[PDB]
Design a protein around this ligand. Structure first.
Ligand SMILES: OC[C@H]1O[C@H](Oc2c[nH]c3ccc(Br)c(Cl)c23)[C@@H](O)[C@@H](O)[C@@H]1O
Ligand SMILES: OC[C@H]1O[C@H](Oc2c[nH]c3ccc(Br)c(Cl)c23)[C@@H](O)[C@@H](O)[C@@H]1O
Ligand SMILES: OC[C@H]1O[C@H](Oc2c[nH]c3ccc(Br)c(Cl)c23)[C@@H](O)[C@@H](O)[C@@H]1O
Ligand SMILES: OC[C@H]1O[C@H](Oc2c[nH]c3ccc(Br)c(Cl)c23)[C@@H](O)[C@@H](O)[C@@H]1O
Ligand SMILES: [Ca+2]
Ligand SMILES: [Ca+2]
Ligand SMILES: [Ca+2]
Ligand SMILES: [Ca+2]
Ligand SMILES: [Mn+2]
Ligand SMILES: [Mn+2]
Ligand SMILES: [Mn+2]
Ligand SMILES: [Mn+2]
Lengths: 230, 230, 230, 230
């Protein structure tokens, strides 16, 4: 199956598969059961920002989520991604909804990779036909230039049981055997609105094998990334 | 047929079809018959460097070729590429040999585009299997990490009647209806060695429609870019 | 006297020293009387954006001003800036008021120089004590993180007969004898509000000798750059 | 006294003041007695490369030293620089010799810093009179465009008992009250030649209070950074 590394903004506590009993950000290494989590003070209706970083000498993957004026949540995990990921990968964003729902709106996205070659892209607006994105599932761009990862209505209300992803078109070379150091950094901003008492399910930035696709049965709590909850 | 904009390093004068009667650099807008040329101050067997720039406010496409800072050649052409290229393009390098030949060896390649969105890539080495490149024709990477656009013997001798290109995998968004300014910059370094008194044929950097392919009959003098010499 | 290259956003027509009789953007080379101008559709109270670019192979200095949802104004001038500028410079922003007035509020500023060596800075907020800026005249930063080039009261009301500049602290190496190409790009966003029927005087981005200071007599129509109107 | 954070490339084991008994790289937090070290297979006469990285979320400072076709040396250390350094710093390079000696030749240096505002500089050659560096002590640039941190003769032969440093002219803003994440990355390439059987003393990259100067008594084993060995 696919090989997945991800940072999850997990809106809904699925304590039956190991989630903590609160909204959380987490670091997922080949399993939906995060190797490290931190409590996330989710704020419906406000734009948030996530920053993600990794360095192969440090061997530490880190993420921070924040909102204007409010305080930040951070999570880190010690890992050597070279013992986890292949040499070439793709990078993307995923989101799901399930029985409960929320908008999974992406307002901007940037990524930089360096191998010692380099790759850098940034979107502050998404076009009507983003030919540099591989859109999977229900993901689509709307009339305002925003990336709606899961289905939203004509008037802006989210739908349940929706899944979608967006991958950057070009593969990324993140290691080699003559390699001295590799790094990446990513940023995205997002807007989550929900009519539900308990919004669900979440948003991820993830890194996978180049031929990755939405797995069978990855809806809801599995965030469009994993085929099961092992 | 493809839509083509290129900067050509034309080592062999094909007066047949409008080449000036000397090795030259040129700017090609939808034709092999350059809109602007300059006599090429060459140094065969030395590493040369090419810098290409364009800005949609200035409406000026420019290139400089130099050899370790010496022996400079420049060419420029006033043009609004918005009325020439489609909104989404691919960018790449091409080269050919013909009856006469030369190595068409790329040692590095970088490109940056900004729309007001941005894309930047840079290769100081080419891997044995570059998954972020679309290799076409005879193009390949060798054991020293160099990109050989045309065929070279296992001992380094160039072969004749060869054609090859390398395209960056992801499409590039160069214009948009509400655009204020768009720009791009490209750099590459090359090594041309030849056993012939009259080496041939040349190297280009080019921009094209995303689905561009080597046209039939585009070898030698046509630089792997055009179907005919109109 | 200093040596000045500047892009001016001139809100007030001073027809006795060569201004066209409307608000205009212009390119200034060692004189307040612009080498090139374009009619500027000035919109008080709306945030504007300026992009400026130069390449030494193209030899074209270009600028564009725009507002969200409105048309753009562009101006260009053909020039080899190494005939005008020293090898080392400082880059900066300037603004004035006179009998009539306006706010000269800078919200963000970025600059990139490349010498084929590079320098790049970007500010999206100015700190209360910006130790990487040389503040001259009346320039200061306010509580909102904005750079007020000319004086405003505690209520935000602009004052007349004010002059102010901000220089980036580090000298920039914009030309070098071994260089094959030199380039720079600059962007700023600005907010000009005014209670006057004819607001005045203007904002510039400029490049000057490293020890540039506000010349005596440079108020008002001279934009804080020039000692006279020759 | 100054406040110093440094990455040391230490050629000479001074075991009386805490050095391991072999050449080593180390991370120095307000003391020459490194908080973390790694054994360094130093190779005189070959160009080496150092990459340094830090991110305020991961809170890990790391460094890697490599030569062409050799194994790398890595060192890391967990630290929150917000508790160590002031908000505004200068960044620089230092080197010493003592009774024993070596060339401390810097061929290139680059630095990037981001605060969530950004600063980036890169030198692949140094000017013979660099107006954007603060040179201290014996440091100077030569006619080849290399930065000689310690003295060399007309012949290129290094001198003993030398100390020199080079700081980038612009202060850097590495933290603030409302900061969410700060990061930096640095690279330099160096050539250490020596005629001595035990070369000495070393090279550093360092971050300090903006007004830092060479401390009295900082020669030799104190690397031009510290006044004592506590
Ligand atoms: O969207 C939130 C969740 O909705 C569903 O889970 C349930 C939430 N409340 C329930 C009540 C009953 C049953 Br049966 C189920 Cl599966 C659920 C499932 O779709 C989950 O995967 C998802 O995380
Ligand atoms: O490599 C140089 C050139 O060689 C060929 O053209 C010829 C130039 N002189 C000739 C002489 C004989 C024959 Br057959 C041919 Cl095809 C040619 C063709 O391959 C040209 O397209 C190419 O530019
Ligand atoms: O701010 C707009 C202008 O005001 C002044 O010039 C005048 C414009 N209208 C006037 C009317 C009367 C007198 Br006195 C003066 Cl100095 C002026 C001067 O300060 C000019 O430098 C400036 O351009
Ligand atoms: O450059 C190498 C070393 O030389 C000096 O230390 C000595 C090393 N071996 C010695 C032998 C004799 C005497 Br006296 C001295 Cl100072 C030393 C001192 O300068 C040290 O700080 C330095 O690290
Ligand atoms: Ca969950
Ligand atoms: Ca030809
Ligand atoms: Ca005026
Ligand atoms: Ca030592
Ligand atoms: Mn979870
Ligand atoms: Mn030609
Ligand atoms: Mn004017
Ligand atoms: Mn030591």
């Amino acid at each position: 199956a696919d090989t997945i590394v991800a940072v999850e903004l997990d809106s809904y506590p699925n304590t039956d598969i190991g989630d903590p009993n609160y909204p959380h950000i987490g670091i997922d290494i080949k399993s939906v059961r995060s190797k490290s989590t931190a409590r996330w003070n989710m704020q419906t209706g406000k734009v948030g920002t996530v920053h993600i970083s990794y360095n192969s000498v440090s061997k530490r993957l880190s993420a921070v989520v924040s909102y204007s004026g409010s305080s930040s949540t951070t999570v880190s995990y010690d890992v050597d991604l070279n013992n986890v990921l292949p040499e070439w990968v793709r990078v993307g964003l995923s989101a799901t909804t399930g029985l409960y729902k929320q908008t999974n709106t992406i307002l901007s996205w940037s990524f930089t990779s360096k191998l010692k070659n380099s790759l850098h892209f940034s979107f502050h607006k998404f076009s009507q036909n983003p030919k540099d994105l591989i859109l999977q599932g229900d993901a689509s761009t709307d009339s305002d230039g925003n990336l709606q990862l899961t289905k939203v209505s004509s008037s802006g209300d989210p739908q349940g049981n929706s899944v979608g992803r967006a991958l950057f078109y070009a593969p990324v070379h993140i290691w080699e055997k003559s390699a001295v150091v590799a790094s990446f950094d990513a940023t995205f901003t997002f807007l989550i609105k929900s009519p539900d008492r308990e919004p669900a399910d979440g948003i991820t930035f993830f890194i996978a094998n180049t031929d990755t696709t939405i797995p069978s049965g990855s809806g809801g709590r599995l965030l469009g990334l994993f085929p099961d909850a092992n």
